[PDB]
Amino acid sequence: CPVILVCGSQDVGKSTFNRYLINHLLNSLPCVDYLECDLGQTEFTPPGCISLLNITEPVLGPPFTHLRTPQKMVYYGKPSCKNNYENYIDIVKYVFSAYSPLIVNTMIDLIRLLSPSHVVQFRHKLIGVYTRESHNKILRDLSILSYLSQLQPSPLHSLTPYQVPFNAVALRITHSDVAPTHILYAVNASWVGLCKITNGPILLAQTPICDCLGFGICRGIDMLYHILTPVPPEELRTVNCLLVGAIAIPHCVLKCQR
Amino acid sequence: CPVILVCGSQDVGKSTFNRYLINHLLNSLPCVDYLECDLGQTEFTPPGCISLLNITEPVLGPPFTHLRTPQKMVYYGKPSCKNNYENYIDIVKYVFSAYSPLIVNTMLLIDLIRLLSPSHVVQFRGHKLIGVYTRESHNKILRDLSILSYLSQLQPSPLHSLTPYQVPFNAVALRITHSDVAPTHILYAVNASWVGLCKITNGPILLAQTPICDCLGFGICRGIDMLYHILTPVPPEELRTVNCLLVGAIAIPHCVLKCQR
Amino acid sequence: SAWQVSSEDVRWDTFPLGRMEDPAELMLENYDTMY
Amino acid sequence: SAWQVSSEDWDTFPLGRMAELMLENYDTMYL
Amino acid sequence: GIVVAWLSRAEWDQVTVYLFCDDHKLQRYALNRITVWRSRSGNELPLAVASTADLIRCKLLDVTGGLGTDELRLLYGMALVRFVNLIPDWIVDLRHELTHKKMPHINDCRRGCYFVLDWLQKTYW
Amino acid sequence: IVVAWLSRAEWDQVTVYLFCDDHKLQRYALNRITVWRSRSGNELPLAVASTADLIRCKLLDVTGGLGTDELRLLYGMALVRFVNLIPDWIVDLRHELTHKKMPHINDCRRGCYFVLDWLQKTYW
């Protein structure tokens, strides 16, 4: 089970290579493992997540059609890290410690640190195989709309949400400095990640490296977290924290409904 | 009392006009009054002082020879304001409140004409204007020569050999004008310095705001071992009224602190 | 743990996606803190 | 008050030498 | 329709009124309500709003006396330089004297900041 | 020659104590340079002013000082003044500081103690 890596720049065909390679491998081998280091071009997840996905069914379309449940998941929050290249590389270890042939998608340390056996490039066995902003944002807000499509059997505000008092779920606002008193407005009508780790706020102090289990939307808080979840009801009980990141509900959800 | 005022720029001869006008007036009139608004070209005072001086004897030489006791005196500290034209103007009224014909020397300009009710606008470059028409090393020697002339009143003797006075650290207040010195480390700014013996147990008794006091003289604090050993040429009768020291942007001439014999 | 399914509530029908106007409805002066 | 004319010793030590006078307590006067 | 960081016009007005009507406690209630609109846009605020918030962050420390004059002048100078660079000769030359020459007097930058805060009262807010 | 320091117990104790942190020996030796301002009228050499500012920033940053937005205000001004008065890792930071978006707090919390090491061997 050699570990396969991918190293490429913009417009080289690496995602299509991953799709084609998984499709070819699914004929002979029964299962294949997938590790995603991309944060803005995630395939099986909503944007901003680092995950070790698993494939048992072939991939025959765009990334917003084959959403699966990651084996291991971390909700970084940001679609791309450009100033803190010591936490994403630190998150990778927490995600990598769950590893069937493995495909590693990437955006010297990355080539190392994983004990790989293949460094396929599509631009340690060198192979190579030598082969916009407004359009890359539509597919990032289209995978989120695909995660919310699991709530349909119904208007998005019409479904019955869950409830939790302000003493059973903690709250953290990643990638911001929100004043502790004025924090219920940064989480009201937002897009929170239902991660896992009376009175009012239960705020944390540091950003934890948790295991995200799903994604939910808060709809309102009157002085009860009315949290709408597409997560299966069996998995809601383990949810005990909320982490807001640089990923909000698509404006079409919040805009004019019918 | 036709108050006279002077206005001019650098090198126009304004300084060599009060020497001549007062000389001419001293023949007829018995006494003449003088108000000094200059801070770096003071005539009868060490630099940095705003004073209302008095003349009963003619002026026949450079400013470092006519050192006389001002009638009123304020120790600003810096021989140029150039940043705070709301305190030098405020000091002038305090000096003017002790007001014989009066000559006013000047280094703002419009306000300097007002606030005094003048009767003359002599220029030498009531608004009766008679404005007839007529560097950093030479102007810094004549400022230390005047200070060395104030310290020459201690001679009957080496400058460190004269017996100084002393006052414990509880009877004289201390203020460091024109600086921000940490309160704990304040006794090093007053050691071997040039302080103005102004008037207004635990070591420091420092103030909090700069007062508009009436300076009475200048002294030297030779040392403070943990007593204010003040070497002062002020007459001993006037020392008793001294209760405040104000350090400003005027230090001892380096020749005084340098090698003594 | 405490995760109520909201078995009986009726309000959400028209547009309560953020209207559940005085800027003090969810105002706060006290907050806990974990570590 | 009054100023006491010194009767101690001045010729020997120079102007300045009479961290030794370090301080931690200071009074404060308000005008 | 549009999506905005402010919930209703009562939040776009309470901040607009409380930011300049100081009271020493209404400019801090409405100073912590703009660190929330940073979260509503990921981590970003308009340049004008950031400058307006910075210039009152500076004010709420020279009124109280947070630290010394040397350290309190560092906030004022940085804020004014960021204001001028991003958004008469009395103000324009102040940034040059701040960055390239001797440290300006504290009252100079105090008056400059107090004046420039009036620029944002009529132009943006 | 007249100097602002009385002897070598003020030109060396301050030199040693400015960089040996102890959280209380750079505060004793930071208030002993506000005294050399009085002894020079109101002026300090540009290098000494920059060095004092860069530790004024630190002693508030290490203790806790104020919020992050109000701590890169000291750091940014100090670094910009230091660069202007006294490569590309530290020389290009001023452009992001004054002309573009606010640099991350860790960028300052690395550049400041980088430049503080530059004055340890060149001047002090």
Side-chain angles (χ1 to χ4, degrees):
Chain A
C1 47
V3 158
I4 299 157
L5 194 102
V6 164
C7 272
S9 49
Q10 304 89 298
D11 229 315
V12 300
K14 24 190 292 190
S15 285
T16 315
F17 153 69
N18 303 286
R19 287 176 221 173
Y20 218 164
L21 175 67
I22 297 163
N23 270 356
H24 261 94
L25 251 59
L26 270 155
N27 272 133
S28 324
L29 300 158
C31 315
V32 172
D33 253 16
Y34 191 80
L35 173 81
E36 180 97 50
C37 304
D38 201 307
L39 279 161
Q41 249 50 60
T42 36
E43 231 170 274
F44 290 23
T45 40
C49 285
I50 305 165
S51 42
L52 187 105
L53 325 160
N54 164 349
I55 301 112
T56 70
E57 213 212 312
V59 174
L60 293 126
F64 66 88
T65 39
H66 33 102
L67 293 205
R68 321 217 194 285
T69 304
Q71 176 167 112
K72 184 150 223 61
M73 161 85 98
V74 167
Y75 179 56
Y76 186 41
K78 297 138 205 66
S80 69
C81 37
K82 289 169 307 171
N83 209 98
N84 306 24
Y85 327 82
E86 60 172 347
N87 284 327
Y88 140 77
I89 325 188
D90 193 281
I91 283 173
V92 157
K93 273 81 144 299
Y94 188 91
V95 169
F96 204 108
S97 80
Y99 170 49
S100 314
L102 186 91
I103 287 110
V104 174
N105 221 58
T106 76
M107 301 215 198
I108 292 315
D109 201 323
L110 256 201
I111 278 194
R112 212 246 312 156
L113 194 99
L114 323 167
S115 63
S117 171
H118 258 67
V119 281
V120 190
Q121 176 205 60
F122 273 64
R123 196 181 277 173
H124 200 314
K125 181 52 195 70
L126 292 192
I127 295 165
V129 185
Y130 228 77
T131 305
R132 197 251 206 188
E133 209 39 66
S134 187
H135 180 277
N136 218 5
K137 191 253 203 173
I138 262 61
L139 289 112
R140 287 217 280 100
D141 287 14
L142 192 47
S143 320
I144 292 175
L145 251 168
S146 289
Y147 202 94
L148 298 174
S149 100
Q150 325 187 354
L151 277 170
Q152 319 293 321
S154 298
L156 213 57
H157 56 262
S158 149
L159 316 100
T160 286
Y162 284 22
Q163 309 163 176
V164 76
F166 304 5
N167 202 34
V169 303
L171 216 165
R172 172 124 196 78
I173 311 273
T174 39
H175 201 189
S176 207
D177 314 271
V178 157
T181 52
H182 294 32
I183 205 160
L184 292 187
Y185 178 54
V187 86
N188 175 94
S190 86
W191 170 269
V192 293
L194 294 200
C195 293
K196 179 233 170 205
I197 173 51
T198 86
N199 174 27
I202 323 98
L203 327 169
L204 279 94
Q206 311 141 230
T207 289
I209 300 204
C210 58
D211 256 12
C212 180
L213 313 161
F215 281 82
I217 296 175
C218 191
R219 56 153 273 110
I221 21 189
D222 60 327
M223 311 265 288
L224 261 183
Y225 285 122
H226 288 57
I227 274 285
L228 259 167
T229 84
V231 202
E234 191 273 335
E235 220 148 300
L236 263 319
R237 316 205 203 277
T238 326
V239 164
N240 76 281
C241 66
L242 315 182
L243 288 151
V244 192
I247 287 283
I249 43 179
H251 298 167
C252 300
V253 156
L254 194 50
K255 273 172 69 175
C256 303
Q257 316 131 75
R258 294 161 312 233
Chain B
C1 314
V3 160
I4 311 202
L5 180 120
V6 191
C7 280
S9 43
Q10 219 155 21
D11 221 320
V12 297
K14 30 173 286 199
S15 277
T16 308
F17 152 71
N18 325 271
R19 289 178 221 176
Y20 220 163
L21 163 55
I22 295 174
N23 269 356
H24 271 268
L25 256 60
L26 269 156
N27 283 125
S28 325
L29 303 158
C31 313
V32 170
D33 255 25
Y34 186 82
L35 173 80
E36 180 97 51
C37 304
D38 200 307
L39 280 164
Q41 252 47 75
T42 36
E43 230 168 274
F44 291 18
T45 42
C49 285
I50 308 166
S51 42
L52 186 106
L53 312 147
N54 182 356
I55 296 108
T56 84
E57 210 206 324
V59 177
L60 290 125
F64 67 88
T65 41
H66 342 292
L67 285 206
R68 323 212 203 263
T69 303
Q71 167 167 122
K72 193 83 151 141
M73 161 85 98
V74 170
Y75 179 55
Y76 189 39
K78 314 151 48 203
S80 67
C81 59
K82 293 327 154 207
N83 184 224
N84 295 24
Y85 327 84
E86 35 184 318
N87 284 337
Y88 145 79
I89 302 286
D90 197 273
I91 286 173
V92 158
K93 278 84 99 304
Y94 188 92
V95 171
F96 200 27
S97 97
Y99 180 84
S100 313
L102 182 92
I103 288 104
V104 177
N105 221 57
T106 65
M107 307 213 202
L108 204 48
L109 219 296
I110 281 314
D111 194 12
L112 263 194
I113 278 194
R114 211 247 297 186
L115 272 174
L116 316 152
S117 96
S119 165
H120 259 65
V121 177
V122 188
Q123 171 212 71
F124 257 66
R125 169 228 284 165
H127 205 291
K128 186 66 200 64
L129 78 174
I130 325 161
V132 308
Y133 249 91
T134 321
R135 182 51 47 220
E136 263 313 311
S137 202
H138 179 276
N139 221 9
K140 222 265 300 180
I141 265 298
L142 270 89
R143 294 221 321 261
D144 287 22
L145 244 180
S146 319
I147 290 175
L148 251 168
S149 289
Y150 202 96
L151 298 171
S152 97
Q153 324 188 353
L154 281 167
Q155 319 293 322
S157 298
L159 211 44
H160 54 85
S161 151
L162 317 102
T163 282
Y165 283 25
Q166 55 199 50
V167 49
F169 299 16
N170 41 287
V172 295
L174 206 293
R175 171 125 194 79
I176 311 272
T177 39
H178 316 314
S179 200
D180 317 272
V181 155
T184 45
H185 299 225
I186 208 158
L187 292 184
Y188 179 52
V190 202
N191 198 89
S193 84
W194 166 273
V195 290
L197 294 205
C198 290
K199 177 271 292 182
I200 179 45
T201 309
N202 292 342
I205 187 191
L206 330 165
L207 289 95
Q209 328 213 298
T210 288
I212 301 203
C213 61
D214 256 15
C215 180
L216 312 162
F218 287 85
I220 317 272
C221 183
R222 75 166 313 268
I224 31 191
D225 62 326
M226 279 212 31
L227 260 189
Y228 279 118
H229 292 244
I230 290 288
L231 253 172
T232 176
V234 189
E237 193 274 334
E238 224 151 290
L239 259 324
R240 313 204 205 288
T241 325
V242 168
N243 83 86
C244 159
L245 328 174
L246 285 148
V247 199
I250 288 284
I252 46 183
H254 297 168
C255 300
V256 159
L257 195 44
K258 273 169 69 174
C259 303
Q260 316 101 303
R261 300 162 312 231
Chain C
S1 163
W3 264 99
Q4 286 113 61
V5 302
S6 202
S7 284
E8 32 125 330
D9 304 80
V10 189
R11 178 188 301 187
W12 338 285
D13 199 74
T14 68
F15 304 93
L17 210 29
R19 194 139 269 141
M20 202 205 68
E21 255 183 288
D22 273 303
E25 155 97 352
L26 27 71
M27 257 297 158
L28 276 168
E29 65 144 86
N30 70 88
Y31 47 91
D32 201 14
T33 296
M34 296 204 182
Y35 258 106
Chain D
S1 296
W3 291 38
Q4 178 173 352
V5 197
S6 275
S7 85
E8 306 99 308
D9 199 346
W10 310 126
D11 188 317
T12 323
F13 29 76
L15 272 146
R17 171 146 51 248
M18 101 164 297
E20 101 181 353
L21 47 154
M22 261 294 267
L23 269 187
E24 51 274 313
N25 45 298
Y26 49 93
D27 196 357
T28 296
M29 302 197 35
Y30 260 108
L31 293 192
Chain E
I2 44 181
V3 173
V4 286
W6 30 92
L7 212 173
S8 51
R9 271 322 195 79
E11 283 202 79
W12 183 230
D13 277 348
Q14 278 305 79
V15 173
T16 310
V17 164
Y18 279 32
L19 219 61
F20 295 80
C21 169
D22 40 64
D23 208 281
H24 190 293
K25 204 43 52 193
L26 304 191
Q27 41 186 6
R28 200 165 252 164
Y29 154 93
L31 199 81
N32 288 10
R33 190 77 89 67
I34 328 182
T35 61
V36 189
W37 304 351
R38 290 216 326 250
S39 150
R40 280 313 212 185
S41 314
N43 212 22
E44 283 143 40
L45 257 193
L47 301 189
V49 181
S51 281
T52 313
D54 280 324
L55 292 159
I56 314 192
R57 292 157 116 85
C58 291
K59 225 171 72 188
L60 284 170
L61 283 162
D62 100 84
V63 165
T64 283
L67 17 74
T69 314
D70 287 288
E71 293 140 57
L72 220 174
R73 207 178 339 176
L74 287 176
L75 306 184
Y76 271 111
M78 192 56 258
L80 292 169
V81 168
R82 269 200 85 77
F83 189 98
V84 170
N85 274 103
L86 265 65
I87 321 89
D89 260 340
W90 165 39
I91 276 298
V92 154
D93 221 347
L94 197 33
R95 106 181 175 89
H96 189 290
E97 171 146 40
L98 268 165
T99 67
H100 290 68
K101 290 202 313 297
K102 332 156 48 154
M103 201 85 248
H105 203 209
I106 169 66
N107 317 119
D108 203 303
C109 57
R110 292 221 224 159
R111 305 167 336 164
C113 165
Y114 283 40
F115 148 76
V116 66
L117 274 159
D118 210 279
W119 216 73
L120 309 160
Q121 174 164 130
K122 284 105 189 154
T123 301
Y124 174 70
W125 295 97
Chain F
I1 287 272
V2 171
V3 284
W5 29 92
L6 208 164
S7 80
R8 299 321 269 256
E10 315 211 51
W11 187 228
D12 278 348
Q13 290 282 45
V14 170
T15 307
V16 161
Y17 279 32
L18 216 60
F19 295 81
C20 155
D21 318 5
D22 210 290
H23 185 268
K24 204 43 52 183
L25 305 188
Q26 24 186 9
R27 193 82 257 182
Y28 147 92
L30 207 65
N31 290 8
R32 195 82 91 68
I33 327 179
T34 59
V35 189
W36 302 354
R37 292 215 324 248
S38 100
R39 299 230 68 116
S40 313
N42 202 91
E43 282 133 31
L44 258 185
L46 290 188
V48 201
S50 294
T51 318
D53 287 322
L54 291 159
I55 313 199
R56 289 158 120 83
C57 290
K58 186 198 284 164
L59 292 158
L60 285 149
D61 163 38
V62 175
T63 284
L66 321 94
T68 294
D69 296 278
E70 296 145 43
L71 241 54
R72 42 209 179 139
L73 280 182
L74 306 172
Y75 269 120
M77 191 66 276
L79 292 168
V80 165
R81 269 194 83 76
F82 172 84
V83 165
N84 296 342
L85 295 204
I86 286 278
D88 267 357
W89 144 242
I90 203 51
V91 186
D92 206 86
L93 194 38
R94 70 181 276 250
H95 195 286
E96 283 149 72
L97 266 173
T98 57
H99 294 61
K100 283 191 320 287
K101 334 158 47 167
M102 198 97 255
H104 199 31
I105 173 66
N106 312 118
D107 231 350
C108 305
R109 288 201 176 137
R110 283 172 337 154
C112 165
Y113 327 84
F114 156 69
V115 291
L116 273 164
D117 222 308
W118 192 88
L119 305 155
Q120 173 164 130
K121 307 160 242 309
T122 309
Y123 168 60
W124 286 109

